[PDB]
Amino acid sequence: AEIGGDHGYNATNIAAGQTSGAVTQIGPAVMGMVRRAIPNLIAFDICGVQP
Amino acid sequence: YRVYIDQYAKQDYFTVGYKGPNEMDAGIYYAPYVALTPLRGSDPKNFQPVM
């Protein structure tokens, strides 16, 4: 008869693990990490180098 | 391009998207958690099955 319940679909409750049911969630798992991509260079064969 | 057909398109369009080699680099994520669980039972008053 115990209702597992649902979070409020509020970011705060989801992050904290607040559900409205019997059990309170530890934490919102881990799906991955997203990082900005590193751009490429135009190299330097378009002008002289002469180190 | 991998051209697909949205056969239930409402009027007319085309939508270009991206999908990299990675699963994090998607645009929109669809994360299955519980998948097509079958639940069966019977009603004792009539023994007929419910699925």
UniProtKB/Swiss-Prot annotation, chain A:
Family designation: Belongs to the Tevenvirinae major capsid protein family.
Post-translational modifications: A proteolytic cleavage by the prohead core protein protease gives rise to the mature major capsid protein during virus maturation.
Recorded coiled-coil stretches: none
The protein's name: Major capsid protein
Organism: Enterobacteria phage T4
Function: Major capsid protein that self-associates to form hexamers, building most of the capsid in association with pentons made of the capsid vertex protein and one dodecamer of the portal protein. The major capsid protein self-associates to form 160 hexamers, building most of the T=13 laevo capsid. Folding of major capsid protein requires the assistance of two chaperones, the host chaperone groL acting with the phage encoded gp23-specific chaperone, gp31. The capsid also contains two nonessential outer capsid proteins, Hoc and Soc, which decorate the capsid surface.
Highest taxon of source: Viruses
Quaternary structure (record): Homohexamer. Interacts with the portal protein. Interacts with the capsid vertex protein that forms pentamers. Interacts with hoc; one hoc molecule associates with each capsid hexamer. Interacts with soc; this interaction reinforces the capsid structure. A total of 960 subunits of the major capsid protein forms the 160 hexamers.
